[PDB]
Design a protein around this nucleic acid. Structure first.
Ligand SMILES: [Mg+2]
Ligand SMILES: [Mg+2]
Ligand SMILES: [Mg+2]
Ligand SMILES: [Mg+2]
Ligand SMILES: [Mg+2]
Ligand SMILES: [Mg+2]
Ligand SMILES: [Mg+2]
Ligand SMILES: [Mg+2]
Ligand SMILES: [Mg+2]
Ligand SMILES: [Mg+2]
Ligand SMILES: [Mg+2]
Ligand SMILES: [Mg+2]
Ligand SMILES: [Mg+2]
Ligand SMILES: [Mg+2]
Ligand SMILES: [Mg+2]
Ligand SMILES: [Mg+2]
Ligand SMILES: [Mg+2]
Ligand SMILES: [Mg+2]
Ligand SMILES: [Mg+2]
Ligand SMILES: [Mg+2]
Ligand SMILES: [Mg+2]
Ligand SMILES: [Mg+2]
Ligand SMILES: [Mg+2]
Ligand SMILES: [Mg+2]
Ligand SMILES: [Mg+2]
Ligand SMILES: [Mg+2]
Ligand SMILES: [Mg+2]
Ligand SMILES: [Mg+2]
Ligand SMILES: [Mg+2]
Ligand SMILES: [Mg+2]
Ligand SMILES: [Mg+2]
Ligand SMILES: [Mg+2]
Ligand SMILES: [Mg+2]
Ligand SMILES: [Mg+2]
Ligand SMILES: [Mg+2]
Ligand SMILES: [Mg+2]
Ligand SMILES: [Mg+2]
Ligand SMILES: [Mg+2]
Ligand SMILES: [Mg+2]
Ligand SMILES: [Mg+2]
Ligand SMILES: [Mg+2]
Ligand SMILES: [Mg+2]
Ligand SMILES: [Mg+2]
Ligand SMILES: [Mg+2]
Ligand SMILES: [Mg+2]
Ligand SMILES: [Mg+2]
Ligand SMILES: [Mg+2]
Ligand SMILES: [Mg+2]
Ligand SMILES: [Mg+2]
Ligand SMILES: [Mg+2]
Ligand SMILES: [Mg+2]
Ligand SMILES: [Mg+2]
Ligand SMILES: [Mg+2]
Ligand SMILES: [Mg+2]
Ligand SMILES: [Mg+2]
Ligand SMILES: [Mg+2]
Ligand SMILES: [Mg+2]
Ligand SMILES: [Mg+2]
Ligand SMILES: [Mg+2]
Ligand SMILES: [Mg+2]
Ligand SMILES: [Mg+2]
Ligand SMILES: [Mg+2]
Ligand SMILES: [Mg+2]
Ligand SMILES: [Mg+2]
Ligand SMILES: [Mg+2]
Ligand SMILES: [Mg+2]
Ligand SMILES: [Mg+2]
Ligand SMILES: [Mg+2]
Ligand SMILES: [Mg+2]
Ligand SMILES: [Mg+2]
Ligand SMILES: [Mg+2]
Ligand SMILES: [Mg+2]
Ligand SMILES: [Mg+2]
Ligand SMILES: [Mg+2]
Ligand SMILES: [Mg+2]
Ligand SMILES: [Mg+2]
Ligand SMILES: [Mg+2]
Ligand SMILES: [Mg+2]
Ligand SMILES: [Mg+2]
Ligand SMILES: [Mg+2]
Ligand SMILES: [Mg+2]
Ligand SMILES: [Mg+2]
Ligand SMILES: [Mg+2]
Ligand SMILES: [Mg+2]
Ligand SMILES: [Mg+2]
Ligand SMILES: [Mg+2]
Ligand SMILES: [Mg+2]
Ligand SMILES: [Mg+2]
Ligand SMILES: [Mg+2]
Ligand SMILES: [Mg+2]
Ligand SMILES: [Mg+2]
Ligand SMILES: [Mg+2]
Ligand SMILES: [Mg+2]
Ligand SMILES: [Mg+2]
Ligand SMILES: [Mg+2]
Ligand SMILES: [Mg+2]
Ligand SMILES: [Mg+2]
Ligand SMILES: [Mg+2]
Ligand SMILES: [Mg+2]
Ligand SMILES: [Mg+2]
Ligand SMILES: [Mg+2]
Ligand SMILES: [Mg+2]
Ligand SMILES: [Mg+2]
Ligand SMILES: [Mg+2]
Ligand SMILES: [Mg+2]
Ligand SMILES: [Mg+2]
Ligand SMILES: [Mg+2]
Ligand SMILES: [Mg+2]
Ligand SMILES: [Mg+2]
Ligand SMILES: [Mg+2]
Ligand SMILES: [Mg+2]
Ligand SMILES: [Mg+2]
Ligand SMILES: [Mg+2]
Ligand SMILES: [Mg+2]
Ligand SMILES: [Mg+2]
Ligand SMILES: [Mg+2]
Ligand SMILES: [Mg+2]
Ligand SMILES: [Mg+2]
Ligand SMILES: [Mg+2]
Ligand SMILES: [Mg+2]
Ligand SMILES: [Mg+2]
Ligand SMILES: [Mg+2]
Ligand SMILES: [Mg+2]
Ligand SMILES: [Mg+2]
Ligand SMILES: [Mg+2]
Ligand SMILES: [Mg+2]
Ligand SMILES: [Mg+2]
Ligand SMILES: [Mg+2]
Ligand SMILES: [Mg+2]
Ligand SMILES: [Mg+2]
Ligand SMILES: [Mg+2]
Ligand SMILES: [Mg+2]
Ligand SMILES: [Mg+2]
Ligand SMILES: [Mg+2]
Ligand SMILES: [Mg+2]
Ligand SMILES: [Mg+2]
Ligand SMILES: [Mg+2]
Ligand SMILES: [Mg+2]
Ligand SMILES: [Mg+2]
Ligand SMILES: [Mg+2]
Ligand SMILES: [Mg+2]
Ligand SMILES: [Mg+2]
Ligand SMILES: [Mg+2]
Ligand SMILES: [Mg+2]
Ligand SMILES: [Mg+2]
Ligand SMILES: [Mg+2]
Ligand SMILES: [Mg+2]
Ligand SMILES: [Mg+2]
Ligand SMILES: [Mg+2]
Ligand SMILES: [Mg+2]
Ligand SMILES: [Mg+2]
Ligand SMILES: [Mg+2]
Ligand SMILES: [Mg+2]
Ligand SMILES: [Mg+2]
Ligand SMILES: [Mg+2]
Ligand SMILES: [Mg+2]
Ligand SMILES: [Mg+2]
Ligand SMILES: [Mg+2]
Ligand SMILES: [Mg+2]
Ligand SMILES: [Mg+2]
Ligand SMILES: [Mg+2]
Lengths: 47, 271
RNA sequence: GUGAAAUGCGCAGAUACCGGGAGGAACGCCGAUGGCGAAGGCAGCCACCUGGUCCACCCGUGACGCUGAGGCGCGAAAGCGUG
RNA sequence: AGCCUACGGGCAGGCGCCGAGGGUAGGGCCCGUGACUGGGGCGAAGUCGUAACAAGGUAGCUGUACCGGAAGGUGCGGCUGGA
RNA sequence: CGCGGGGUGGAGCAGCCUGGUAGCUCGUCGGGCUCAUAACCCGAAGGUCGUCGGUUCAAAUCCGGCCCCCGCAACCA
RNA sequence: UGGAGCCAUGGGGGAAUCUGGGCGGACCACCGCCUAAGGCUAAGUACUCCGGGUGACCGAUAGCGCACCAGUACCGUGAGGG
RNA sequence: CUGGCCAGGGUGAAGCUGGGGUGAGACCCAGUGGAGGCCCGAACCGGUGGGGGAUGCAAACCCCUCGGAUGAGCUGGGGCU
RNA sequence: CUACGCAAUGGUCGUCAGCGUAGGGUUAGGCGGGACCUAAGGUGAAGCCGAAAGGCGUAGCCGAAGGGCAGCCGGUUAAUAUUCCGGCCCUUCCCGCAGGUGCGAUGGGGGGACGCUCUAGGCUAGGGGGACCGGAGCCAUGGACGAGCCCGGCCAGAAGCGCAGGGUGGGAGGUAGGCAAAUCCGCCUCCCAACAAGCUCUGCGUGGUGGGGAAGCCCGUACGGGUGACAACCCCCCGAAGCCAGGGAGCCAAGAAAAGCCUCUAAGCACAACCUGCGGGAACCCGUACCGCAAACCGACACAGGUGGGCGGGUGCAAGAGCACUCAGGCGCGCGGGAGAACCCUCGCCAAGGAACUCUGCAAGUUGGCCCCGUAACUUCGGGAGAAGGGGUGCUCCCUGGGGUGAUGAGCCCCGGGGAGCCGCAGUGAACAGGCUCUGGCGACUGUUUACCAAAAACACAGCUCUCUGCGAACUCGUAAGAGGAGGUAUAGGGAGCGACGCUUGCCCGGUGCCGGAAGGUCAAGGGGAGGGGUGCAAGCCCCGAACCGAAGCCCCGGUGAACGGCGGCCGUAACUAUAACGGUCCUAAGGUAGCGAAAUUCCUUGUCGGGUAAGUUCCGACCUGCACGAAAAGCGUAACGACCGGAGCGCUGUCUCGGCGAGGGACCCGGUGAAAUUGAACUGGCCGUGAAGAUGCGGCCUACCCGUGGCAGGACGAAAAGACCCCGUGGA
RNA sequence: GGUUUGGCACCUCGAUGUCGGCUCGUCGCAUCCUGGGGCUGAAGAAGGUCCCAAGGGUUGGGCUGUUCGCCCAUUAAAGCG
């Protein structure tokens, strides 16, 4: 039956995207954690 | 009159509709004034703040003139009476000689071709508007203002109307639709006559939808919910409140008066 | 308030009196063994729409009349439905 | 395919329509009977009150309406077959 | 059977806790009023206080034992 | 909350300029301390991404999660896990 | 907020039109018409009963059967809590 | 896509591949996005709010499967094509020339611009015929040289033409309005014109002309290449849900915005400028492979699941996107080969019986389409109705009535009516395809729900009542600003209960709640200070502190039931007996009315009678000592409706007496690949008995050669899950 | 005796599935039939009661989830554990 994951590029960018992370102070901190941790992607990879 | 239906289907055995002869000559609104994109949505910034709203036929908003002192002395011919999805009452589209057109909440009796105007001078005949003070005590009027120059706010629902009881200073005494006796400023405008389409109270929606077409979602009873949801909720197998009728929010709902006690707005009421 | 009482109302200021206001129903005297209507029934005053009926003149039609199963309408009060 | 023929034809025979009646199904009218139940009639003994007839001790009566152990009471209008 | 209320003239209730006093309405008996019965009026009689014991100077009354009456509760498998 | 002063102050009231005014644990009186409602000021102190030096520190299931192309593979929508 | 979708049948409301009827009416006939959380039934939505499956094809599935199917209908995309 | 490959990936194999290595491959002014518009919403100048972070928010800006905008038919590649090429046809910008005109906005107006259902007239897409046109060929196996059989008879196309439609009155005056600036809109007044014409804008046909063009045969790995003919390219018929489109009619629930685009004028500028022509130039950025109901997407997998839009041919069947077969096209599901056990699944048939099965006809059967007769109680007159129950149904020939298109006549399609007759067991001959009835309970009804054990009598529902709310409404969200309510205004909005409709909905304001009461009682801070204290030589500075004045709340007084709620006990009494209309007494705030009643409620209980059965703890009808109905947590009914729960019949059955046979997929044998939970170790028998009281493992006795394979499930207190019950914990929620 | 209702709380709560039916049984005898037998208030036929003896038998339905009962129709009997 219909599962949870229903891929949608626009949806993903708008939601977890870098620009989005940057607006909210919470999102900013995400980036801060990820960078400080040394992640190779601060944001979900999408094209 | 209210149209009735032979029961060729249940729900349509009780369903009754309005008598649309009144409106006639004009179905499509005035692309001029009227045309105003109306916003739907049953709630504010996020959360819903009025339960059970939503759905219901698309709806365009007719922009009516609730303050007639705009064009004092300038008369207008009642061009037509048309349907309006945003209110119980019907509306009358009128062309002023001025050339300008507006929408007035169509009073009972008013007819096409008939002429109307608003001002102190104005003749006391159904359709004209004048500051209450210049209106014969006793006559019935609708679309009344509460405070001068603030717009009509009283008696506008289909078939409603207020009556002038008497004067007393710069104030005139009105008996509002609810039966309340309130002192209203003499300068407040009011248009002579009663609202109209008074058969409105006589329509029987008929089915469960219809109620839906009017954008009214189903209303679920308290006792039917669970303790978390409502004070009446809970209890094994059907039950009686548990004392004393309350709302989902905790306040009593059978009798408890609610208007602000110390509101200055009193000292002007008596009913 | 009654036969007499009590219930009840009233010192939170009633009853009794004056002034103002709201509202609903009914129309005192005239008024009668009176009038009108087919019956039920109809009473302040004003206007509008309207039925019946009586008198006078012998003008006109020329038996065109009477009753009336059924049908149709009206029909006190109480009662019923929507407001 | 039979039998007779005066070789046209007739007869037996075969097929079909109709058909007494039998069958299935669903209706109409009438009769009988049924746990229990409604009201009725008559009662030489019971229980309860007293509604009505004399202002019958609240004039009676009446259509209707609500109520009451019961008769009945009360409201609305009506009658006189009461004053 | 486990908690608790209850048996008082013929009927129905007081009196018991704050032990020495049996009260109330009805009924029953006597007498009036009426022609007579009710109704009304006047006057009386009637109670082992369920039962056997216990405390006390004295027990309907306070304490226990069964005898009956009424009301709760008899849950989770 | 105590006998509750001292320091700060949201509300109300509301002075004085050295005969001024605060404090010395309620409050008075003595005796004494100090000058509120403007501001700045090294050093001694803290920490360790980074560089170096040591180690009765580990020695590839230990030591950092990672000695190795590891915050990777992979998992999760995601934060995150790893 | 903005788009899309719903085979084919069936029943035959109101209105009209004509006739009848009456003082006028109400009303009554046909014909026309094509209403409805109407009927049967695909797509589409659903999940009634039974069987199967139970280290499954499947962390809810398959077959048969069944409900809705112009509506309080189903559905894509864009949003909000 | 291609060339090399096969370790691994592929549930087997593998030379193959969606796999490995490598090289190619995606071409646009017109297709889709962006150098256009606005929707919800987001963001956000001003502005408001907030301890910080941050929350609001007019304009503006962003934001699209919506609006707007110029490409059709063919040809080529191993792999792209409305993109390259060919033919035909367009769009913007810039410049120049000519001819026109008050040109000119971010502003004004118009327009864009709109629902649902049903629909007219024309077309087109698409499809079926043809004696006609063009074709290679073919007469087999008894017959046919035949109007034979077989294959194909189109596409695109500017101007101009026609055929259908769509939009729209033309004038001249005034003018308080369009936040007047207007020659434009808008209103008035009056010559003209009118179920039009004219002017425009679409669609369709035609059009110079340009493409395409089979079956079969020959070559051929692949993919296709000549063939093919100078191919023909015509006539009828059916015909859209698509086009003309902004068409028409009806209806109530009353159906986006903005730009492009017309037009009006403002500043400005008129040697500007726009407008129409005609030339010559200029025209960017991103996407374009391939998969795309699936082995390439979401499901850990090449997973029987899930995934939006369009096309989706033919014959037949009443119709159809249904069903059966079938084109084009695509597939045979990435383990096979044998056997012919039990048993399992899915499937077919069955003597006699026909529910006896069983909790239950669960399951399966029966019935099934269409046409025609013909249909009951009851009813809210719609319905119940497909009630029931019957008959017809194929093929052949004769006769005959209407329609559409043609032309009134011919073929071609579309509905019919009447006669004769033929063959089978059977004519909706296969596939799709209701079993029916009677009678109860609940709920009025369509609808909604526990995604994944409940679809219901639960929720919702129209409708009824109560109650709050006079508008900066009440109420909800928020610290606030603000927002919803509502651009609504008591015929409205919130809250509550009941739950279509019919007939109704009694009595009790003692207690609780809410409503009303300018008096009293009590009552905090604060006001007030009689009077008292600590200190000082003191003036003083400090403390406590009674009277009395002091809100709401509570007390108190009164109301209120579709407010929370409640609605009696014991004795006696009437011709046999029963029973008690009546009476007595205690108590209460008042003692349950109508109507129902062993009920979705009745313990005793399978109550007692009736009914239905041969037999009936259920069911239906009654009675009423209702453990423990009862009026809006409604009461009693009710046509219709229901995959709801009960009881009966008829029909028919493998449910059953009672089982038998047959089929296919497994099971079994061979070849290939090859798991799992579980597992103290094992050399793991029966009976009595013993033992922590249920022993393969102790005792005694008995039985027993070693090892497997197909089967069955009594035991290993078999597996699984640190029992969901129970108690415990001074555990949790 | 160990089939009822219990009492006790000994193994089992890191699980010993708890009524009824169906299927398949097997055993006990305190025997329901059938076979032997003694008394009898046993004339006969039919019974009563006790003794021996399970070898084999020990029906089909209505009702209820029922076990059990009651009932219909039979039977040699419609046994209890
Ligand atoms: Mg996943
Ligand atoms: Mg997207
Ligand atoms: Mg890197
Ligand atoms: Mg917002
Ligand atoms: Mg509700
Ligand atoms: Mg619930
Ligand atoms: Mg509450
Ligand atoms: Mg609560
Ligand atoms: Mg209950
Ligand atoms: Mg409750
Ligand atoms: Mg007169
Ligand atoms: Mg004459
Ligand atoms: Mg009358
Ligand atoms: Mg009356
Ligand atoms: Mg009444
Ligand atoms: Mg009335
Ligand atoms: Mg016959
Ligand atoms: Mg009878
Ligand atoms: Mg009798
Ligand atoms: Mg009397
Ligand atoms: Mg009398
Ligand atoms: Mg009397
Ligand atoms: Mg009367
Ligand atoms: Mg009375
Ligand atoms: Mg009277
Ligand atoms: Mg006594
Ligand atoms: Mg006496
Ligand atoms: Mg006497
Ligand atoms: Mg419990
Ligand atoms: Mg301060
Ligand atoms: Mg201060
Ligand atoms: Mg100085
Ligand atoms: Mg200080
Ligand atoms: Mg100080
Ligand atoms: Mg000090
Ligand atoms: Mg100090
Ligand atoms: Mg100091
Ligand atoms: Mg300083
Ligand atoms: Mg300083
Ligand atoms: Mg500093
Ligand atoms: Mg510093
Ligand atoms: Mg350091
Ligand atoms: Mg390590
Ligand atoms: Mg090592
Ligand atoms: Mg993942
Ligand atoms: Mg990932
Ligand atoms: Mg009609
Ligand atoms: Mg329907
Ligand atoms: Mg259907
Ligand atoms: Mg489709
Ligand atoms: Mg779906
Ligand atoms: Mg669902
Ligand atoms: Mg499905
Ligand atoms: Mg299912
Ligand atoms: Mg289910
Ligand atoms: Mg299943
Ligand atoms: Mg199953
Ligand atoms: Mg199984
Ligand atoms: Mg079906
Ligand atoms: Mg279906
Ligand atoms: Mg959607
Ligand atoms: Mg989305
Ligand atoms: Mg190769
Ligand atoms: Mg392999
Ligand atoms: Mg490759
Ligand atoms: Mg650029
Ligand atoms: Mg843009
Ligand atoms: Mg924009
Ligand atoms: Mg916006
Ligand atoms: Mg914001
Ligand atoms: Mg904005
Ligand atoms: Mg777009
Ligand atoms: Mg577009
Ligand atoms: Mg390709
Ligand atoms: Mg080209
Ligand atoms: Mg111009
Ligand atoms: Mg506009
Ligand atoms: Mg031959
Ligand atoms: Mg053809
Ligand atoms: Mg052409
Ligand atoms: Mg059409
Ligand atoms: Mg714009
Ligand atoms: Mg492609
Ligand atoms: Mg699929
Ligand atoms: Mg598809
Ligand atoms: Mg596969
Ligand atoms: Mg798949
Ligand atoms: Mg789909
Ligand atoms: Mg067809
Ligand atoms: Mg068909
Ligand atoms: Mg099919
Ligand atoms: Mg093929
Ligand atoms: Mg058989
Ligand atoms: Mg047979
Ligand atoms: Mg049979
Ligand atoms: Mg049976
Ligand atoms: Mg049985
Ligand atoms: Mg079945
Ligand atoms: Mg039915
Ligand atoms: Mg044939
Ligand atoms: Mg045609
Ligand atoms: Mg069929
Ligand atoms: Mg059918
Ligand atoms: Mg029942
Ligand atoms: Mg329902
Ligand atoms: Mg579920
Ligand atoms: Mg259902
Ligand atoms: Mg109702
Ligand atoms: Mg606040
Ligand atoms: Mg609004
Ligand atoms: Mg409401
Ligand atoms: Mg309301
Ligand atoms: Mg309810
Ligand atoms: Mg009563
Ligand atoms: Mg009260
Ligand atoms: Mg009360
Ligand atoms: Mg009271
Ligand atoms: Mg109060
Ligand atoms: Mg004080
Ligand atoms: Mg002193
Ligand atoms: Mg007070
Ligand atoms: Mg006696
Ligand atoms: Mg006697
Ligand atoms: Mg007697
Ligand atoms: Mg009761
Ligand atoms: Mg009763
Ligand atoms: Mg019974
Ligand atoms: Mg009960
Ligand atoms: Mg019972
Ligand atoms: Mg029972
Ligand atoms: Mg019987
Ligand atoms: Mg039976
Ligand atoms: Mg019986
Ligand atoms: Mg049965
Ligand atoms: Mg019954
Ligand atoms: Mg109840
Ligand atoms: Mg009540
Ligand atoms: Mg109630
Ligand atoms: Mg109900
Ligand atoms: Mg009922
Ligand atoms: Mg349903
Ligand atoms: Mg159902
Ligand atoms: Mg049934
Ligand atoms: Mg087989
Ligand atoms: Mg093998
Ligand atoms: Mg043992
Ligand atoms: Mg050993
Ligand atoms: Mg042993
Ligand atoms: Mg074995
Ligand atoms: Mg097995
Ligand atoms: Mg086992
Ligand atoms: Mg186990
Ligand atoms: Mg445990
Ligand atoms: Mg919690
Ligand atoms: Mg035992
Ligand atoms: Mg035991
Ligand atoms: Mg012990
Ligand atoms: Mg256990
Ligand atoms: Mg274990
Ligand atoms: Mg023996
Ligand atoms: Mg013998």
């Amino acid at each position: 039956m219909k599962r949870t994951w229903q891929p949608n590029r626009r949806k993903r960018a708008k939601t977890h995207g870098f620009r989005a992370r940057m607006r909210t102070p919470g999102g900013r901190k995400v980036l801060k954690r990820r960078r400080q941790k040394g992640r190779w992607r601060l944001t979900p990879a999408v094209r | 009159a209210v149209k009735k239906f032979k029961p060729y289907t249940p729900s349509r055995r009780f369903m009754t509709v309005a008598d649309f002869s009144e409106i006639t000559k004009t179905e499509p609104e005035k692309s001029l004034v009227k045309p105003l994109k109306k916003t739907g949505g049953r709630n504010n910034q996020g959360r819903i703040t009025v339960r059970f709203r939503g759905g219901g036929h698309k709806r365009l908003y007719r922009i009516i003139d609730f303050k007639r002192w705009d064009k004092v002395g300038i008369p207008a011919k009642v061009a037509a009476i048309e349907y309006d999805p945003n209110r119980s009452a019907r509306i009358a589209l009128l062309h002023y000689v001025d050339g300008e057109k507006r929408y007035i909440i169509a009073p009972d009796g008013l007819q096409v071709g008939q002429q109307v105007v608003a001002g102190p001078d104005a003749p006391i005949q159904v359709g004209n508007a004048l500051p209450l003070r210049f209106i014969p005590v006793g006559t019935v009027v609708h679309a009344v203002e509460l405070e001068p120059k603030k717009g009509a706010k009283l008696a506008r629902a289909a078939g409603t109307s207020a009556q002038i009881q008497g004067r007393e200073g710069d104030y005139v005494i009105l008996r509002l639709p609810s039966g309340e006796l309130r002192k209203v400023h003499g300068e407040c405008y009011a248009t002579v006559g009663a609202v109209g389409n008074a058969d409105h109270k006589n329509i029987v929606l008929g089915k469960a939808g219809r109620s839906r077409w009017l954008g009214r979602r189903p209303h679920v009873r308290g006792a039917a919910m669970n303790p978390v949801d409502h004070p009446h909720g809970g209890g094994e197998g059907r039950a009686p409140r548990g004392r004393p009728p309350a709302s989902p929010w905790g306040w009593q709902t059978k009798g408890l008066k609610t208007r602000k006690r110390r509101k200055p707005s009193s000292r002007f009421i008596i009913a």
